[PDB]
Coordinates of C-alpha atoms and ligand atoms in Angstrom, one line a residue:
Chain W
X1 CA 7.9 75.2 129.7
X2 CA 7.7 76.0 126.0
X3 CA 9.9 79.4 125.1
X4 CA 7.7 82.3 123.3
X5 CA 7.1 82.1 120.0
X6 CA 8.7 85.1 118.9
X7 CA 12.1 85.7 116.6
X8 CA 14.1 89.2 116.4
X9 CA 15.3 88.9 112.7
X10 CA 17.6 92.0 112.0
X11 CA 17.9 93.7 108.2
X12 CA 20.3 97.0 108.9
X13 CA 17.9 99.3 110.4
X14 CA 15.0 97.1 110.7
X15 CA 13.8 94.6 113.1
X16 CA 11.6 91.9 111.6
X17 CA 9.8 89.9 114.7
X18 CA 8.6 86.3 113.5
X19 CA 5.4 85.6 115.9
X20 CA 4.2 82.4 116.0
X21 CA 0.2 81.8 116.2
X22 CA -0.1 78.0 116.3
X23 CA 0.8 74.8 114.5
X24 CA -1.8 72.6 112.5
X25 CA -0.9 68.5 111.8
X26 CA -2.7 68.5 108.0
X27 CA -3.5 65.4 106.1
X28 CA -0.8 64.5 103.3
X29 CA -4.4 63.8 101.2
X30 CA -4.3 67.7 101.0
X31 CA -1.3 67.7 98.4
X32 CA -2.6 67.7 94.9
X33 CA -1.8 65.5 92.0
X34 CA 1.2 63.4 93.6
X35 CA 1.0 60.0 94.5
X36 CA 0.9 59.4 98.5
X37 CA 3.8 57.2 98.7
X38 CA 6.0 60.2 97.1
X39 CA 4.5 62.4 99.4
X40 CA 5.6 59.9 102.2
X41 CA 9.0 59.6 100.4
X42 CA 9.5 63.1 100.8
X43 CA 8.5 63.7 104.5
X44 CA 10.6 60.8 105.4
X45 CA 13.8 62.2 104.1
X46 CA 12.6 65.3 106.2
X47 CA 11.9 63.2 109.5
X48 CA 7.8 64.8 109.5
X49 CA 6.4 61.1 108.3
X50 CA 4.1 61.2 111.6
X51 CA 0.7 59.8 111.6
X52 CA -0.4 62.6 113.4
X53 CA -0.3 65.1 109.8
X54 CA 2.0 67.0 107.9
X55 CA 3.3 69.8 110.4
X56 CA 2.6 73.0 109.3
X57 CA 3.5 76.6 111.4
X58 CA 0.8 79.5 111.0
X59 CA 2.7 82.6 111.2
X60 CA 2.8 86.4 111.1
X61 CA 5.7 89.5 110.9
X62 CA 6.0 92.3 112.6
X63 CA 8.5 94.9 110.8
X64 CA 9.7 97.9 112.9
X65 CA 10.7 100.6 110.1
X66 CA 11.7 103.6 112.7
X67 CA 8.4 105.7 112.4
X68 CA 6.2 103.1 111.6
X69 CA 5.7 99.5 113.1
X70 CA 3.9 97.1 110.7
X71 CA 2.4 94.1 110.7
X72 CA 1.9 91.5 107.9
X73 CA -0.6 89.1 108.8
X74 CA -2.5 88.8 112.0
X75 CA -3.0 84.8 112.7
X76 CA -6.5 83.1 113.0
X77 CA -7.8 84.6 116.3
X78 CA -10.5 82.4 117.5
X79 CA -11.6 81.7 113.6
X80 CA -10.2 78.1 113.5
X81 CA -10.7 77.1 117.3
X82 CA -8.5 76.8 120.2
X83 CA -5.3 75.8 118.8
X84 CA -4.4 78.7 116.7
X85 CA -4.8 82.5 117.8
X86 CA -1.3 83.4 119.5
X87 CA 0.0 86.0 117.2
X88 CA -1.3 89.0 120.0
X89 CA 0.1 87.2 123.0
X90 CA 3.7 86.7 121.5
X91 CA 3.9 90.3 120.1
X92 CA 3.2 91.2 123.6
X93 CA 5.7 89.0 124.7
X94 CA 8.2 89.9 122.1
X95 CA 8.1 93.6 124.0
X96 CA 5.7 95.2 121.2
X97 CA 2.7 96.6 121.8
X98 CA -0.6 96.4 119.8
X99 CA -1.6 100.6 120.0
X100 CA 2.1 100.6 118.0
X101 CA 1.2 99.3 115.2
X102 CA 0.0 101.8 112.5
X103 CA -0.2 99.6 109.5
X104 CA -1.4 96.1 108.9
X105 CA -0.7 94.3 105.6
X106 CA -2.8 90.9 104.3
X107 CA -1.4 88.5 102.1
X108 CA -5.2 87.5 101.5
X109 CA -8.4 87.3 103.3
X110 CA -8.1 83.6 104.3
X111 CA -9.1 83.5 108.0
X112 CA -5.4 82.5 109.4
X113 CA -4.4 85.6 108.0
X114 CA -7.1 88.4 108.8
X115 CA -9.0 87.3 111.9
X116 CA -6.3 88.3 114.3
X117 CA -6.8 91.8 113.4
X118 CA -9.4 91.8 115.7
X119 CA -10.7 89.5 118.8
X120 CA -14.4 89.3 120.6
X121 CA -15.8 91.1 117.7
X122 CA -13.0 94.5 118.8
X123 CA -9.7 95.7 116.9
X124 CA -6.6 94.4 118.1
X125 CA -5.0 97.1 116.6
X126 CA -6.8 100.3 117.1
X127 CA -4.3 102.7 115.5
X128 CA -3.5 100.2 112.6
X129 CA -5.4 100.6 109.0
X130 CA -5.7 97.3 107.8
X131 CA -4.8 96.8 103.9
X132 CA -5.5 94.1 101.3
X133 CA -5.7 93.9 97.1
X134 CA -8.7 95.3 95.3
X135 CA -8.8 91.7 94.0
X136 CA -9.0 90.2 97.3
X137 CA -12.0 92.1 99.0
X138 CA -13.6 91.6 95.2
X139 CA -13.6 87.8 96.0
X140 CA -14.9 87.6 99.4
X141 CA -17.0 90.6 99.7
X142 CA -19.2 90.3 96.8
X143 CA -23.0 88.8 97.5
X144 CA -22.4 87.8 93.9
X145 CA -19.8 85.5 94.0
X146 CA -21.5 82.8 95.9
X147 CA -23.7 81.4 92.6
X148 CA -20.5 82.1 90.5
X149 CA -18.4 79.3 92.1
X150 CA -19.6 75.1 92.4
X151 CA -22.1 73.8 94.5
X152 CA -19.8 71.7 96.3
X153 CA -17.4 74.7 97.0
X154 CA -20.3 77.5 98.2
X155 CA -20.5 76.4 101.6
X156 CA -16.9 77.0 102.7
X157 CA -17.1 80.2 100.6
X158 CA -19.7 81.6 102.3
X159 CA -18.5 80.2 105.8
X160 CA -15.7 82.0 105.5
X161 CA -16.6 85.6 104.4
X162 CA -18.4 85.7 107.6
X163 CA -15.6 85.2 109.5
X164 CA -13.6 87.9 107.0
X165 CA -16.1 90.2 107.6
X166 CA -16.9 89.9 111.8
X167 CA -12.9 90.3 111.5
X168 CA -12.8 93.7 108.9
X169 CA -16.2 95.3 110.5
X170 CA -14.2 97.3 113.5
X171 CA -12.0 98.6 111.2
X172 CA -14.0 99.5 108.6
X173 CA -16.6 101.4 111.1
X174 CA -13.3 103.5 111.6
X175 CA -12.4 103.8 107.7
X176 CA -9.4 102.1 108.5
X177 CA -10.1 99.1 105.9
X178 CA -8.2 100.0 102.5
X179 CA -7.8 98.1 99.3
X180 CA -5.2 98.9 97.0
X181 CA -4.2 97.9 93.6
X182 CA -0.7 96.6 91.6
X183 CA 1.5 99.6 91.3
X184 CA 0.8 100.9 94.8
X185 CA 3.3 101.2 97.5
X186 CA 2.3 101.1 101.3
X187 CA 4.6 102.6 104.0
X188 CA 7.5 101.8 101.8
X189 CA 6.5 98.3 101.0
X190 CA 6.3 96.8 97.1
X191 CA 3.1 95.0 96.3
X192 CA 3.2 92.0 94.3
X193 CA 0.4 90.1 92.7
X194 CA 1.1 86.6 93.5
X195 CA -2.5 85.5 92.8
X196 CA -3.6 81.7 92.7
X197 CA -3.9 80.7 95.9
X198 CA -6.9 83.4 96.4
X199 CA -8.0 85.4 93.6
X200 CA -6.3 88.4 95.2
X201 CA -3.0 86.9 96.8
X202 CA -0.2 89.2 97.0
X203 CA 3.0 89.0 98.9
X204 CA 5.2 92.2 99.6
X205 CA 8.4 93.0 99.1
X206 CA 10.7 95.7 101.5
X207 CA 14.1 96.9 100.2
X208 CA 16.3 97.7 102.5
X209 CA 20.5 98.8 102.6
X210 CA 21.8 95.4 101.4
X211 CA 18.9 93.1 101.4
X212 CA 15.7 92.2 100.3
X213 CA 12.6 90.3 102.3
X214 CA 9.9 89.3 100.5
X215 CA 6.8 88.4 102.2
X216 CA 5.6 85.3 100.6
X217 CA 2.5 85.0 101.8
X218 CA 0.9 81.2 100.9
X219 CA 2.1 80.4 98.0
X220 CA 3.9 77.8 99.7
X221 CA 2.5 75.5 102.5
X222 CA 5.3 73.2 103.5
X223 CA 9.2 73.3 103.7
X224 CA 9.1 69.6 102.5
X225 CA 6.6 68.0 99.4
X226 CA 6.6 71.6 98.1
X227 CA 10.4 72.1 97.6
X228 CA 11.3 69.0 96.1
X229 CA 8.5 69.0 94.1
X230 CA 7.3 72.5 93.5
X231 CA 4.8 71.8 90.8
X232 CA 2.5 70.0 93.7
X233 CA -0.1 71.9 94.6
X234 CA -2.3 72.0 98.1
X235 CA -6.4 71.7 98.3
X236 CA -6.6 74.9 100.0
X237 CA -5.6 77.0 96.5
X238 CA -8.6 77.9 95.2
X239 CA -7.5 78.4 91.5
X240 CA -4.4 75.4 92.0
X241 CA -2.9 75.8 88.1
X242 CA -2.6 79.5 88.4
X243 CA -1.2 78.6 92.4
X244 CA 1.4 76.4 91.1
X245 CA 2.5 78.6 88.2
X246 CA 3.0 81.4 90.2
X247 CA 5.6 79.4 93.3
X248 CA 7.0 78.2 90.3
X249 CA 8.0 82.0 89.3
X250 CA 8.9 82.9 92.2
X251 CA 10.3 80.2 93.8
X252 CA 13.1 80.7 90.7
X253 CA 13.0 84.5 91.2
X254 CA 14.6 83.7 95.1
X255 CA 16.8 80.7 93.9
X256 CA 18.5 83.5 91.5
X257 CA 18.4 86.6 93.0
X258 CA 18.7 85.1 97.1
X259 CA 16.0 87.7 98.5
X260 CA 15.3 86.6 102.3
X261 CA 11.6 85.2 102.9
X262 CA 9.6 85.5 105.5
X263 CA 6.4 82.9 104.8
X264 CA 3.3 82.2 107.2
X265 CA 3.0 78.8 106.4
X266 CA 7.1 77.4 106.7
X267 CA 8.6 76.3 110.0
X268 CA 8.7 79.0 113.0
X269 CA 10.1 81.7 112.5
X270 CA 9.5 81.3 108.9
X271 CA 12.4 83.3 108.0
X272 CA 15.1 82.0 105.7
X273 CA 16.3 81.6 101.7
X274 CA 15.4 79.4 99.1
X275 CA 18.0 77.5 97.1
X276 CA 18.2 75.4 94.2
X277 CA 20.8 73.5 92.1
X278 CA 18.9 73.1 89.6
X279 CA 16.0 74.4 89.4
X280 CA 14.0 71.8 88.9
X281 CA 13.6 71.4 92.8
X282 CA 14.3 73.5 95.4
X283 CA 15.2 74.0 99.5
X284 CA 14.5 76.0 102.3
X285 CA 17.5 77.3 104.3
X286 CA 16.2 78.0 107.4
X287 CA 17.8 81.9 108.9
X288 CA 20.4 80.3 111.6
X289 CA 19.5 81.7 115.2
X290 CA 21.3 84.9 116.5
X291 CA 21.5 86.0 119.6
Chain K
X1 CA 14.8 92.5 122.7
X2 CA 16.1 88.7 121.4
X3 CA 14.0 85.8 122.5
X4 CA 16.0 83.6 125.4
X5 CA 18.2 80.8 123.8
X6 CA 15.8 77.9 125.1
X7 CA 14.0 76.0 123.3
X8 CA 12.1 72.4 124.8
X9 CA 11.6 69.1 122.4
X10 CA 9.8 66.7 123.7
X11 CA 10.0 62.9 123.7
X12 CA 7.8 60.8 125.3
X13 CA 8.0 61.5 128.7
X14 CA 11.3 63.2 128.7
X15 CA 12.0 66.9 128.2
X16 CA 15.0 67.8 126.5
X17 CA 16.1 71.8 127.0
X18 CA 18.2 73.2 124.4
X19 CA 20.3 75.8 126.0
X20 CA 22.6 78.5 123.9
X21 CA 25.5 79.3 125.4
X22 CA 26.4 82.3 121.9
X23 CA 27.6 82.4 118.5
X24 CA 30.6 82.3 117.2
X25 CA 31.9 83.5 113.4
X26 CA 35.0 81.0 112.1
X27 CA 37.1 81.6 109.6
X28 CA 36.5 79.3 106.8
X29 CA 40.1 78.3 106.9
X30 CA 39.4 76.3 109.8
X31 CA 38.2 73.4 107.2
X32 CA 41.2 71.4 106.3
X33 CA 42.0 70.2 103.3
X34 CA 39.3 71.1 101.3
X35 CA 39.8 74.3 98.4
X36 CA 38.3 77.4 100.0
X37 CA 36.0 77.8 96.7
X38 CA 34.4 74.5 97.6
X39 CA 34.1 75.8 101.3
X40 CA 32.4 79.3 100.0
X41 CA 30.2 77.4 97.3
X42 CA 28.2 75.5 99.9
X43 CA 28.4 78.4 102.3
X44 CA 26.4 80.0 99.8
X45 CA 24.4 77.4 99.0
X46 CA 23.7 77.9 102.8
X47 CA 23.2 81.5 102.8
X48 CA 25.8 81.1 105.3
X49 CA 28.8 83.2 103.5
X50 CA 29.1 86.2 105.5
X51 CA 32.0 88.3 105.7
X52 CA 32.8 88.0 109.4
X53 CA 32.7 84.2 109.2
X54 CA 31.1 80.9 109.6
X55 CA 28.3 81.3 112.0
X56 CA 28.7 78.6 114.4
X57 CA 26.6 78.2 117.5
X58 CA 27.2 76.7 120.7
X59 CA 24.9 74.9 122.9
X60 CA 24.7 72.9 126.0
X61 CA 21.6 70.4 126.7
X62 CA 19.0 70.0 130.0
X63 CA 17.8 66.1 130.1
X64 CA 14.6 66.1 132.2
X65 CA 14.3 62.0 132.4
X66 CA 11.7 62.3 135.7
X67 CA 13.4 61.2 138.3
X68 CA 16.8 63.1 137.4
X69 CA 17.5 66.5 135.8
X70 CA 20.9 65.8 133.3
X71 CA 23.3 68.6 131.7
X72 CA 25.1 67.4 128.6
X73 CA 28.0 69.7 128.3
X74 CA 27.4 73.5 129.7
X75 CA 29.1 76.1 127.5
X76 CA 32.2 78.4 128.1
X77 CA 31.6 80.4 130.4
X78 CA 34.3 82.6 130.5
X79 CA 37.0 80.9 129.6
X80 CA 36.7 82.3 125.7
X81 CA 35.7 85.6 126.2
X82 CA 31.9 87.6 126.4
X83 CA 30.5 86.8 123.7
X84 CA 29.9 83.0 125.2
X85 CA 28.9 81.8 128.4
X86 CA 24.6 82.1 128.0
X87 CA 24.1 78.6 129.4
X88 CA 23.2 79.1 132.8
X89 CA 21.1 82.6 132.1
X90 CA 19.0 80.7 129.7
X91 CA 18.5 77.5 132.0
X92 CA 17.4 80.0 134.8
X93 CA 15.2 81.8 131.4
X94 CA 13.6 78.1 130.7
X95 CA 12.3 78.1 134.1
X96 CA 14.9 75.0 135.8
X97 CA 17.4 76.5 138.3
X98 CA 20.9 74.7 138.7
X99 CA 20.2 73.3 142.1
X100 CA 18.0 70.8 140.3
X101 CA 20.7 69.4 138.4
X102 CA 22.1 66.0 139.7
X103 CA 24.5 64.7 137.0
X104 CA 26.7 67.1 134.3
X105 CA 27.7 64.4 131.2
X106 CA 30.6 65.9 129.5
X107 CA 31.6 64.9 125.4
X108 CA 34.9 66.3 126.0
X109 CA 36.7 68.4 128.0
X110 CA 37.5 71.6 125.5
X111 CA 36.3 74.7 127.3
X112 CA 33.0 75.4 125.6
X113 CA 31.6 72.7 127.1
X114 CA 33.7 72.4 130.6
X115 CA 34.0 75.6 131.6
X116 CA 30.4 76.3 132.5
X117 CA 30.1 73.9 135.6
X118 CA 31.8 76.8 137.7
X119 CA 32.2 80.0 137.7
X120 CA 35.7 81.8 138.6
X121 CA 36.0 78.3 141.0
X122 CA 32.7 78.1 142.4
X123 CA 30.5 75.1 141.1
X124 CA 27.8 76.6 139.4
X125 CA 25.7 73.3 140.2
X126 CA 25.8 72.6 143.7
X127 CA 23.9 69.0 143.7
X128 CA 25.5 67.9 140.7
X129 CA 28.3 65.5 140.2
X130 CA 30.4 65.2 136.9
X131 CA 31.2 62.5 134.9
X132 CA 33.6 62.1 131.5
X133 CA 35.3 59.6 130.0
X134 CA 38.5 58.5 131.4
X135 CA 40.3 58.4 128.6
X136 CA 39.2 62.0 128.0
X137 CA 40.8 63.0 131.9
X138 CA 43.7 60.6 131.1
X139 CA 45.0 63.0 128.3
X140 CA 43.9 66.3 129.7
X141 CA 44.9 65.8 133.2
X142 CA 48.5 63.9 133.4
X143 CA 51.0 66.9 133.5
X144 CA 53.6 65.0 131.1
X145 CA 51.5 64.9 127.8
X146 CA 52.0 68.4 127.1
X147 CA 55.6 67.3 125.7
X148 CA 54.2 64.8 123.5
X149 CA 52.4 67.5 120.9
X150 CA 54.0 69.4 118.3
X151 CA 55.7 72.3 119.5
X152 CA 53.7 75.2 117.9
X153 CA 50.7 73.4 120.3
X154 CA 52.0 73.1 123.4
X155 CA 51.1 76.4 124.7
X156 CA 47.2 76.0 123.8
X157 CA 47.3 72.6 125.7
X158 CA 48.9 73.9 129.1
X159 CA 46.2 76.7 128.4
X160 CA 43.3 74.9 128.4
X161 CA 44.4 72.4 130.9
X162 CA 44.4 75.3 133.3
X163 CA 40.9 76.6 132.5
X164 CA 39.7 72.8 132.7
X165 CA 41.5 72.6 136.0
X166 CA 39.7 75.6 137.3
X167 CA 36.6 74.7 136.5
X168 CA 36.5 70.9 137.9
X169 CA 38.2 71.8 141.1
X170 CA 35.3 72.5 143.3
X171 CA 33.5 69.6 141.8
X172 CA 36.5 67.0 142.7
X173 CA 36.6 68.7 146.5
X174 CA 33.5 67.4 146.9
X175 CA 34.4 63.9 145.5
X176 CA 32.0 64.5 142.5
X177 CA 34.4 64.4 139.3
X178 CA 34.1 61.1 138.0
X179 CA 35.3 59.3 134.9
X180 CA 33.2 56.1 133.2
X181 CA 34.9 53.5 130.7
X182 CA 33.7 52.0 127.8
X183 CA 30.3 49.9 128.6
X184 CA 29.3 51.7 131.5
X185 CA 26.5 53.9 131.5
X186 CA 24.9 56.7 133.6
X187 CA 21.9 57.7 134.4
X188 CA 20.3 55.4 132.1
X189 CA 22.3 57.1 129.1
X190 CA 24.7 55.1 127.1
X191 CA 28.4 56.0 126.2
X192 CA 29.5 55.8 122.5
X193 CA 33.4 56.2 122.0
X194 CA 33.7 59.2 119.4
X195 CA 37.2 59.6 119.6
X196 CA 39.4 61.9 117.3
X197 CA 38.0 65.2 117.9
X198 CA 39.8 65.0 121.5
X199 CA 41.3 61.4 122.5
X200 CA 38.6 60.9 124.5
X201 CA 35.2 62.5 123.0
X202 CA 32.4 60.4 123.7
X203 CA 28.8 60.6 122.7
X204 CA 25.9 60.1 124.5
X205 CA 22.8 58.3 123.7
X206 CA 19.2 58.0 125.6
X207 CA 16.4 55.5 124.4
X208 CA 12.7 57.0 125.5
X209 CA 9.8 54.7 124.2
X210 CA 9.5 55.3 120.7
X211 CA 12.7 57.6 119.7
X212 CA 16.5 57.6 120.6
X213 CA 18.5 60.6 121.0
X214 CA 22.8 61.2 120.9
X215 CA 23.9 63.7 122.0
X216 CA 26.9 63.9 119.8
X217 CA 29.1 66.2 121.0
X218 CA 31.9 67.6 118.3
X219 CA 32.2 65.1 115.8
X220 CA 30.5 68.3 113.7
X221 CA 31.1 71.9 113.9
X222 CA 29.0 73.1 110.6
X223 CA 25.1 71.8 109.3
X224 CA 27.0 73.0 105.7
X225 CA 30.3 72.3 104.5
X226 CA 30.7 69.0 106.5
X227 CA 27.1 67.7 105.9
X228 CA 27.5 68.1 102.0
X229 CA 31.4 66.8 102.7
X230 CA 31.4 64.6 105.4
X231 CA 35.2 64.1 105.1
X232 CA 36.2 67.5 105.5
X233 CA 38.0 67.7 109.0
X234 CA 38.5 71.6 111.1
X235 CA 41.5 72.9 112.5
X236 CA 40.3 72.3 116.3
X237 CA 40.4 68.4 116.0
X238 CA 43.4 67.3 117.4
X239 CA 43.6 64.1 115.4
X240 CA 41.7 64.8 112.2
X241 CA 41.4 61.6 110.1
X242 CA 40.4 59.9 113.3
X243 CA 38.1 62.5 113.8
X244 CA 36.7 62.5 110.1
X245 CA 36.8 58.3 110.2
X246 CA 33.9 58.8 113.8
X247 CA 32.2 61.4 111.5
X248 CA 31.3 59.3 109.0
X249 CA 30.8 56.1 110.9
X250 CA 27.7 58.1 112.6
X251 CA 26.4 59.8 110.1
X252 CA 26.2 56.4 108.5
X253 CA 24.5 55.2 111.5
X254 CA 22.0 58.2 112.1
X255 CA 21.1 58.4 108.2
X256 CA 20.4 54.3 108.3
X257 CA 18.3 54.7 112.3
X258 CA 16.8 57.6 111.9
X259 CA 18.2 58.8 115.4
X260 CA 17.2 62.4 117.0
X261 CA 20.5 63.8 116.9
X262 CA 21.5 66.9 119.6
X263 CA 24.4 68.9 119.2
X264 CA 26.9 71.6 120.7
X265 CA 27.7 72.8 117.5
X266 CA 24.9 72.5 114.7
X267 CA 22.9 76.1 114.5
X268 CA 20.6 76.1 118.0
X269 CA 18.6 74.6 119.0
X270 CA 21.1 72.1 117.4
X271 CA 18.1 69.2 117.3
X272 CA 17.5 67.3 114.4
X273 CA 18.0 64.5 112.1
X274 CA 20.1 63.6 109.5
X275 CA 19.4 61.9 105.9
X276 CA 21.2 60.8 103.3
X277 CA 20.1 60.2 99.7
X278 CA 23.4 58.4 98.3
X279 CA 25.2 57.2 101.3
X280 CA 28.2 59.8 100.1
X281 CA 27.0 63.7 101.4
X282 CA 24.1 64.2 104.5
X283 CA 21.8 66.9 104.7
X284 CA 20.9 68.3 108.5
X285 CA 17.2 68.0 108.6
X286 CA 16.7 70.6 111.6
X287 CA 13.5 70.2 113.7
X288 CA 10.2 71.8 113.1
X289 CA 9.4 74.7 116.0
X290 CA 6.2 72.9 118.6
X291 CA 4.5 74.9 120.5
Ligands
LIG1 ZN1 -4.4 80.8 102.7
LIG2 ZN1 -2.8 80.4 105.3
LIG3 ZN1 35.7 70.5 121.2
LIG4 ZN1 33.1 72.5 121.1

């Protein structure tokens, strides 16, 4: 019965599709350094206090430039079992096809983010080179790194980078896997090095006539404990300090300068604007729906 | 290339279908009373200060209780012109078709929500029969009143009475207009007095197991300048200091009880809650996108 989880979000001359891969319920345990009852203080005055975890959309963007269609972020695939993986069905849906897109853009190399690049072990995409930070494919690629990080954190490590690389291997046997580094630009996108959450996180920005969308990427994970209280970070951030510092620049950046955001991790479509009277805390202004 | 304006919330075992009927762009001299400053400082707070106007949706609602399919008010057809009148394409988009609705509940009977139960004369709901308050028919329908408004809106009133005319005509042939009064109920769904907005507007309210739903009708026509000032009234109420004294009374209410609030005129799907951190301004907490 559900509609598709797609969004048409117009900029001038480009489309922006919102598609929607799945939803996850996360424990509020996951929110760093906050006591739980102000974490349940906050998701009460936001009516998403429910037993079953914190709701939380997964999310990618599609960006139709004229020439070139690209696509930032690709979902989880089959990475993160059976609940996630819809990003290919609702660009389908959405009237896109996947031979359109040329250009794929990662925030980071977290699974929910690169394994819908490809599905089965085969592309998705097969005309689309697939880019991510030098940084980025540093962290995860490097038999090295495994010793360099905690016991208790090596397992996960290593569990993920296979998934990165089952993900990444079709594209690189076509050399159509391509780090880049700060400075770069890529099909008229801005990178910006918005590291914390991964080593190599960055979030792009595109310019267009009269407006601004960043990309975002997950330096935030929730419309609600996040905004109110910005300095709390999540257990997913792998360097947390350097994770909070950097929503905290941002997050003031868009308060100021009212660029539009389009973020994986805030409510479907994940499009909208960030305001604060303060500073101190923030909110998310949700786009409000055209048709 | 936009997705269909439907979207389906779910409570318990009832299926609510938000249904978009268009957009429309208001002046923001249609808020009374309050300086237009104020009125563009929270539209910007919003991100809502464009120049064509204040984005304003409007919305009808499917209420799928089992045994009986329910439309809570059904758009405007084309009683305002083509930009409205989506309701019915996006029911048949959602997958229902108007034969399987049984009972149209109406807040009020001001075109964007009357006019969609026909089209050009023809009910548009053949199974269906009509109910609205009586007070509501009372002032719409006795041909005298017209002469007991101010001059300068006489001429909408004898307007709209003929549009509301046309549109309940093939529904009264058949002996299926019907008004309720004060206590009764239908359906299963309570009826809340909301007058002030028209003399008659009434809300209506549904308890599944576990959550209660109004559907509020116009005692709102903004998430922005009327959340943050609950007081301020608009230009289409036809008594605005009743109007503003309902709007605060349930505001009160749904900030204190936590209701599931559905509305014609909050940005669509128009379901959500509403909290309060003071008692004094409400925030429009909308609901978080389920697959
Ligand atoms: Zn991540
Ligand atoms: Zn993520
Ligand atoms: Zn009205
Ligand atoms: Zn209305």
């Amino acid at each position: 019965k559900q509609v598709a989880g797609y969004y048409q979000y117009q900029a001038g001359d480009v489309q922006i599709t919102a598609l929607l891969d799945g939803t996850n319920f996360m424990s509020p345990n996951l929110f760093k350094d906050i006591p739980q009852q102000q974490v349940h203080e906050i998701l009460k005055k936001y009516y998403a206090d429910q037993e079953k975890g914190v709701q939380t959309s997964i999310n990618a963007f599609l960006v139709n430039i004229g020439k070139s269609l690209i696509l930032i972020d690709s979902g989880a695939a089959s990475c993160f079992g059976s609940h996630l993986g819809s990003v290919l069905s609702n660009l389908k849906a959405s009237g896109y096809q996947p031979e359109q897109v040329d250009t794929i853009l990662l925030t980071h190399l977290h699974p929910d983010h690169v394994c819908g690049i490809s599905k089965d072990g085969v592309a998705n995409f097969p005309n689309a080179t697939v880019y991510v930070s030098n940084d980025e494919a540093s962290f995860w690629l490097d038999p090295k790194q495994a010793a360099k990080l905690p016991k208790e954190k090596q397992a996960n490590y290593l569990g993920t980078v296979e998934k990165i690389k089952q993900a990444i291997a079709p594209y690189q046997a076509k050399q159509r896997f391509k780090t880049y580094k700060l400075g770069d630009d890529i099909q008229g996108f801005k990178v910006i090095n918005t590291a914390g959450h991964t080593p190599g996180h960055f979030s792009y920005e595109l310019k267009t006539k009269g407006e601004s969308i960043v990309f975002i990427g997950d330096i935030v994970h929730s419309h609600t404990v996040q905004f109110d209280r910005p300095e709390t970070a999540i257990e997913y951030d792998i360097d947390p300090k350097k994770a909070v510092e950097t929503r905290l620049k941002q997050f003031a950046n868009f308060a100021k300068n009212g660029q539009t955001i389009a973020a994986p991790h805030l409510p479907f479509p994940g499009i909208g604007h960030t305001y604060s009277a303060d500073g101190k805390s923030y909110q998310w202004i949700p786009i409000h729906f055209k048709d």
